[PDB]
Amino acid sequence: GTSQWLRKTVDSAAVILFSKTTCPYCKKVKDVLAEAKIKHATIELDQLSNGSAIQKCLASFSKIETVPQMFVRGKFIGDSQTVLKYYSNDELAGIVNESKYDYDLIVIGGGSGGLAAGKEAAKYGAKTAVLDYVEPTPIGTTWGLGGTCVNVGCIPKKLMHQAGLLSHALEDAEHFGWSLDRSKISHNWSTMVEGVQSHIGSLNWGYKVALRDNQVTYLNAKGRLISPHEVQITDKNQKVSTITGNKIILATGERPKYPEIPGAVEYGITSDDLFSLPYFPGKTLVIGASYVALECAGFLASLGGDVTVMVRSILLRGFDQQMAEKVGDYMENHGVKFAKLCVPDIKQLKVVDTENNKPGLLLVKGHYTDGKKFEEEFETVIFAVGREPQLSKVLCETVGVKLDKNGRVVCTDDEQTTVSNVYAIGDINAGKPQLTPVAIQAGRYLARRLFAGATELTDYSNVATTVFTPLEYGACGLSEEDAIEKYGDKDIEVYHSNFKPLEWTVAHREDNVCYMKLVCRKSDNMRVLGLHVLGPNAGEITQGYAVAIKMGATKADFDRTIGIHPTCSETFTTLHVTKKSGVSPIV
Amino acid sequence: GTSQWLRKTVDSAAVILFSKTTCPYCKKVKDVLAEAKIKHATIELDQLSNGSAIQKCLASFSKIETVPQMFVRGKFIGDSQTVLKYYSNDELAGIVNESKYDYDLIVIGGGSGGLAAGKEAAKYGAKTAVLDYVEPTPIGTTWGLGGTCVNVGCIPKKLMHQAGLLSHALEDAEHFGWSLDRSKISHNWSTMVEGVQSHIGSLNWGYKVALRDNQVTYLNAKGRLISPHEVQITDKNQKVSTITGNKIILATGERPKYPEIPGAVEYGITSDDLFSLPYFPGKTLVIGASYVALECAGFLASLGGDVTVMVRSILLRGFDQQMAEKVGDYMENHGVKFAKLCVPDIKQLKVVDTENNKPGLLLVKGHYTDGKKFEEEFETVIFAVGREPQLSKVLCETVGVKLDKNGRVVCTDDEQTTVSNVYAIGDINAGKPQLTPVAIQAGRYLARRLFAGATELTDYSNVATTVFTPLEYGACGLSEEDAIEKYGDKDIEVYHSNFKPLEWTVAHEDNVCYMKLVCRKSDNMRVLGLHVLGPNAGEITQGYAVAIKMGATKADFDRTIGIHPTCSETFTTLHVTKKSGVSPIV
Numbered sequence A: 001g002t003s004q005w006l007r008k009t010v011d012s013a014a015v016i017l018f019s020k021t022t023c024p025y026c027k028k029v030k031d032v033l034a035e036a037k038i039k040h041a042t043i044e045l046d047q048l049s050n051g052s053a054i055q056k057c058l059a060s061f062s063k064i065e066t067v068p069q070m071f072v073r074g075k076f077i078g079d080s081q082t083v084l085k086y087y088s089n090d091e092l093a094g095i096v097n098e099s100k101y102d103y104d105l106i107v108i109g110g111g112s113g114g115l116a117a118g119k120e121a122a123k124y125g126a127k128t129a130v131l132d133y134v135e136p137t138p139i140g141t142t143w144g145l146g147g148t149c150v151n152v153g154c155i156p157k158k159l160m161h162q163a164g165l166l167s168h169a170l171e172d173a174e175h176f177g178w179s180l181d182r183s184k185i186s187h188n189w190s191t192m193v194e195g196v197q198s199h200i201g202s203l204n205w206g207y208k209v210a211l212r213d214n215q216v217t218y219l220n221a222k223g224r225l226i227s228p229h230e231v232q233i234t235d236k237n238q239k240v241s242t243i244t245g246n247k248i249i250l251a252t253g254e255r256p257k258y259p260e261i262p263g264a265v266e267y268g269i270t271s272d273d274l275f276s277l278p279y280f281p282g283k284t285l286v287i288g289a290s291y292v293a294l295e296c297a298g299f300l301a302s303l304g305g306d307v308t309v310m311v312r313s314i315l316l317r318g319f320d321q322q323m324a325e326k327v328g329d330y331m332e333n334h335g336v337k338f339a340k341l342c343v344p345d346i347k348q349l350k351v352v353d354t355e356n357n358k359p360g361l362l363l364v365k366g367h368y369t370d371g372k373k374f375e376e377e378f379e380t381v382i383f384a385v386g387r388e389p390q391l392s393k394v395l396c397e398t399v400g401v402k403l404d405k406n407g408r409v410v411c412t413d414d415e416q417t418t419v420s421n422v423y424a425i426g427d428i429n430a431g432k433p434q435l436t437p438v439a440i441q442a443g444r445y446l447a448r449r450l451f452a453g454a455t456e457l458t459d460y461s462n463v464a465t466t467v468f469t470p471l472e473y474g475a476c477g478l479s480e481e482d483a484i485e486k487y488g489d490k491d492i493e494v495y496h497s498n499f500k501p502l503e504w505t506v507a508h509r510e511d512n513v514c515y516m517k518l519v520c521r522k523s524d525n526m527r528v529l530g531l532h533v534l535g536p537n538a539g540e541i542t543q544g545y546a547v548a549i550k551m552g553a554t555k556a557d558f559d560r561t562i563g564i565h566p567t568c569s570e571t572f573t574t575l576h577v578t579k580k581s582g583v584s585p586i587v
Numbered sequence B: 001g002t003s004q005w006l007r008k009t010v011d012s013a014a015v016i017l018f019s020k021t022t023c024p025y026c027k028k029v030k031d032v033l034a035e036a037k038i039k040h041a042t043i044e045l046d047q048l049s050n051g052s053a054i055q056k057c058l059a060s061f062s063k064i065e066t067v068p069q070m071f072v073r074g075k076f077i078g079d080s081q082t083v084l085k086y087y088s089n090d091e092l093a094g095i096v097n098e099s100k101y102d103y104d105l106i107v108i109g110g111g112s113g114g115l116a117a118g119k120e121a122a123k124y125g126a127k128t129a130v131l132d133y134v135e136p137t138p139i140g141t142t143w144g145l146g147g148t149c150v151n152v153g154c155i156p157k158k159l160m161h162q163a164g165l166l167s168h169a170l171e172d173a174e175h176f177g178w179s180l181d182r183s184k185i186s187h188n189w190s191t192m193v194e195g196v197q198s199h200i201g202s203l204n205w206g207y208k209v210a211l212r213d214n215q216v217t218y219l220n221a222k223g224r225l226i227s228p229h230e231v232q233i234t235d236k237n238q239k240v241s242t243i244t245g246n247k248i249i250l251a252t253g254e255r256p257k258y259p260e261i262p263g264a265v266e267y268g269i270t271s272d273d274l275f276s277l278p279y280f281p282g283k284t285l286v287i288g289a290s291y292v293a294l295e296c297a298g299f300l301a302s303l304g305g306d307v308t309v310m311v312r313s314i315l316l317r318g319f320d321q322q323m324a325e326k327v328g329d330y331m332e333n334h335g336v337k338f339a340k341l342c343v344p345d346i347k348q349l350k351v352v353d354t355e356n357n358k359p360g361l362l363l364v365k366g367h368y369t370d371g372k373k374f375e376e377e378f379e380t381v382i383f384a385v386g387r388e389p390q391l392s393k394v395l396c397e398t399v400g401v402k403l404d405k406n407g408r409v410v411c412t413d414d415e416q417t418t419v420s421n422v423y424a425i426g427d428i429n430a431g432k433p434q435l436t437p438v439a440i441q442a443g444r445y446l447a448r449r450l451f452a453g454a455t456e457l458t459d460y461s462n463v464a465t466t467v468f469t470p471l472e473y474g475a476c477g478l479s480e481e482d483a484i485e486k487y488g489d490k491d492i493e494v495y496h497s498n499f500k501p502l503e504w505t506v507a508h509e510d511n512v513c514y515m516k517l518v519c520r521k522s523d524n525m526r527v528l529g530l531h532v533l534g535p536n537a538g539e540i541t542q543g544y545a546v547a548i549k550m551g552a553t554k555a556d557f558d559r560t561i562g563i564h565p566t567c568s569e570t571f572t573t574l575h576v577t578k579k580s581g582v583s584p585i586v
């Protein structure tokens, strides 16, 4: 048991010190490393349960039973007296820095998971390189370090959500007594794009400063893993070279798909382009029905766009479909137009006016599911039909990393690939939820297991979401259909209720459009299987309940907790209408 | 053991059926009972783990062992066949209205807790009356059915907070691309009050309609308990009479205090007057430092008022004091002036202009704790120096209801007072968190124990709160100083971090929002307190109150993933300790 663990820890760690909080001979050696500015992991043996057993099992490497013991890259360096002799004789710097490869860790991908892994590893003395490179979009769009969320995903889209929400705040302000007249106020797209971009620029810079102050090498280069320990890099002059690393982490993420139809790549755009577009999109057609499509369609309408969404079959495939539909009914009622059961077949009538900063004009041809024909003009056309990786760019097939039928890396539950020194994290890890906090947790936790002796794994179950559509949708756990299909209709009870935010009363907003429900399993103490809420601030509402769900909350737990008044969330502490009872859920 | 539960359930219930979901004789009786529109409790014996043992105990009352068994106010009515006989003979309607008293229940007090008990009790057949009367304030302000929260508390003051917040939403809009100019925009107090008052009116009406539809008697009169079962009522014409009830629930709430200084009652107002005021307060002095004081001073400043708060000693006594100071710093940095360590010793310079709709003018004199003198002019002086009950106005001293030193009712953990048919709920129940959702839960759960045999008690531990100051403050559990006092500094670890909402980056402060977790080293690092200052602090906090209730630890917070981008997600990655001395800024 403990012998399997200590073997792999000592082999994997770069510099690791087995210590005791009390022993002043360990304090002496801690301070010497600190003075020499040598980073390392520590393992305080007095603070562990099998702590005493490890000390005796440590003698198998060192032939001593005592603390401290210093290892460097799988090799015993010495006790307190031996480490101090190396220090006095100016030999210690040479011992720690000498390695089989160039780096202990090479990270391919400077995104959410990738930067998180890098900094964490560097805290234990691992010598780390982070590679990042942004291949331009078909029209040339490029951005800086930090990944997809930072430059063209969560961060820019939510700020554009917020500009869109602020419009209803000016609508509301009159009813609450302010003297503005929302009718005579307009929106400037380029002004907003400049503020979003000025903030994205502060995060690019902050990531470079962070990497530098952890002594991480940052190479803006395209990386390719040609052998288990060899990464070939092509820099921005196309200078090719090769570096070696002990552990390898792949964190290269995904990029948007285009449909295989004429005009799409030539005349359309994706989210990658939307967030630094120099001109207002104008009359827009969004093709797709994922959360990217609905979210992007949502803020454009709220900034005064004439928006249409073309839907192949359903909205938010893979989400609870009752909720998905309520999200879409709200959009259709508040300015978004839907062309349902419809696909595209894209002609250019005007070129983008790059000097004057005006969109072009395009003609979209398609057909509906029955047979009827679609044809309409649009100034901008956005595709949101899913994302994919292209590991063939990243990974030579001769290395022997196994991929699945979607193009994603098959890992074990500790992120290990089929090559024992190669791991994958984030969106390219097959089967895992594709969310930025998941990538960050995975990368951080793997760094500790590789260099600090940690054994904790990332829990991928019951991770909560939020779709930032004009009315938001938070969730944690199973959809209603998924629970029913898994356990049987007669074993599921559902508690639901409409509600109305108190901030909507004076504003004369809708009475029975916000909604929530608890999906529960009767034969398991009425355990909460999923939580769902459509309303404002849905992410702040949902997040706290994810801890309780993680802990196995029951309906009785929600019941005996007392609500905070007046809030939207408190409606969860008093649910009581069931679906089976037939009673209406309206306020 | 089980026998003492049944004897107490059959004695208080008004109409109760003992049943089995399986039995078709039980179904037959059920069908008759609400064909006649007779409300009743039902106890399905095959869903209670000791339904066998209970059925045997029933015979001590009924001489029979089978189901269905129906009782009315403690007397056994009959089995299946006996009730059906009574039906076809037109006798059953008169059995169920047999009572020693006018009402199965009388609630004195028509607010958060009182309305909640009354509706729920009526659901199981209990003949119920709810009493509500609103004594005028010194200037004569009065309002309608629903209590303090609905009329002069949570509801109106949060609507006014929302009006304060929209001001910063207007400022933020320019930075996000909108064409307005915030400096050319002002606020209309009376437009706002009309909207708030319209909503409050629709709440008054909804509560009246709700009581009607549950067959509850609403008497707009002032009640006084003269004996355990006798309630003296005085109606709007000063007519006096007496009604009797079996059970009594006191739920009369509290009212604002005034300081005993000259001019306070004559020339000042309280929150009781603020939310229906015809004129904008104007330059305002706020006296006190409770959450009412700070909340009210907060939105007045955001609507363009010139606001000073006079603080006797500290802010928010009783809450975590690190958080109190941060709440006040933000207010001082965004408009609100503070006169600290200072009390008032009120002379009137202008009478309120009732025609043109304008405030008067006042002269406040006071002193700081060092002796130095205070003297300044204001248009409106608001007193927020606490609240209190006045039970010598509900409750003859001879009834035998014991009160504590502050005049609140001393109750067992099941809301029973010292007279065994009389109960107290809400703000007048000594020692209990004074909050509306606590009043509501206490009332509903007591109704179920009295008329439907339930046994669940109200759990008053770890109830979370939110202070709706211009930057909000949500909490659940122990403060940091309290945690340290109970367990000692060495057994307490505190994780904390600053943060900045994403909504704030484009609108241009970096390190004002703050959160911490107060944990216990020896109990697996249990979470003893959660604290967060920032926007939507109530939506943020609520969900965590469920996990705390279940006994959450630092490791439970760590294994849950965040939702990005949100403020709340910052709780799932805390790692800097106060011990470490490391800075919590970002």
Ligand SMILES: Cc1cc2nc3c(=O)[nH]c(=O)nc-3n(C[C@H](O)[C@H](O)[C@H](O)COP(=O)(O)OP(=O)(O)OC[C@H]3O[C@@H](n4cnc5c(N)ncnc54)[C@H](O)[C@@H]3O)c2cc1C
Residues within 6 Å of the ligand: A108, A109, A110, A111, A112, A113, A114, A131, A132, A133, A134, A135, A146, A147, A148, A149, A150, A152, A153, A154, A155, A157, A221, A222, A223, A224, A251, A252, A253, A254, A271, A292, A393, A394, A425, A426, A427, A428, A434, A435, A436, A437, A439, B564, B565
């Ligand atoms: C429009 C949109 C909105 C989203 N909104 C949210 C949201 O609100 N919340 C949320 O949780 N998630 C959101 N996501 C998803 C989230 O952004 C991703 O799950 C997250 O970015 C994945 O992290 P990652 O590190 O695996 O990949 P990435 O962040 O994409 O990092 C990969 C990086 O590596 C680079 N790279 C690729 N190949 C190579 C190579 N060969 N050599 C060197 N560098 C290379 C890429 O250029 C890129 O910068 C959104 C995604 C999109 C598209």
Ligand SMILES: Cc1cc2nc3c(=O)[nH]c(=O)nc-3n(C[C@H](O)[C@H](O)[C@H](O)COP(=O)(O)OP(=O)(O)OC[C@H]3O[C@@H](n4cnc5c(N)ncnc54)[C@H](O)[C@@H]3O)c2cc1C
Residues within 6 Å of the ligand: A565, A566, B108, B109, B110, B111, B112, B113, B114, B131, B132, B133, B134, B135, B146, B147, B148, B149, B152, B153, B154, B155, B157, B221, B222, B223, B224, B251, B252, B253, B254, B271, B292, B393, B394, B425, B426, B427, B428, B434, B435, B436, B437, B439
């Ligand atoms: C300014 C302010 C803001 C507040 N904000 C919040 C908040 O945001 N959240 C929160 O949870 N709590 C808040 N509170 C507290 C909340 O108002 C109380 O906790 C709650 O109203 C208590 O309910 P209750 O049923 O005990 O009493 P009440 O709701 O006050 O009802 C008691 C009723 O009894 C009536 N009455 C009194 N004597 C008699 C008599 N002799 N005969 C008949 N009727 C009588 C009174 O007129 C009153 O209507 C606030 C309080 C104030 C003052």
Ligand SMILES: COc1ccc(NC(=O)CN)cc1
Residues within 6 Å of the ligand: B142, B143, B190, B193, B194, B197, B276, B277, B278, B279
């Ligand atoms: C008695 O109910 C009220 C009705 C109206 C108001 N005031 C206004 O509408 C404008 N000051 C206040 C209380």
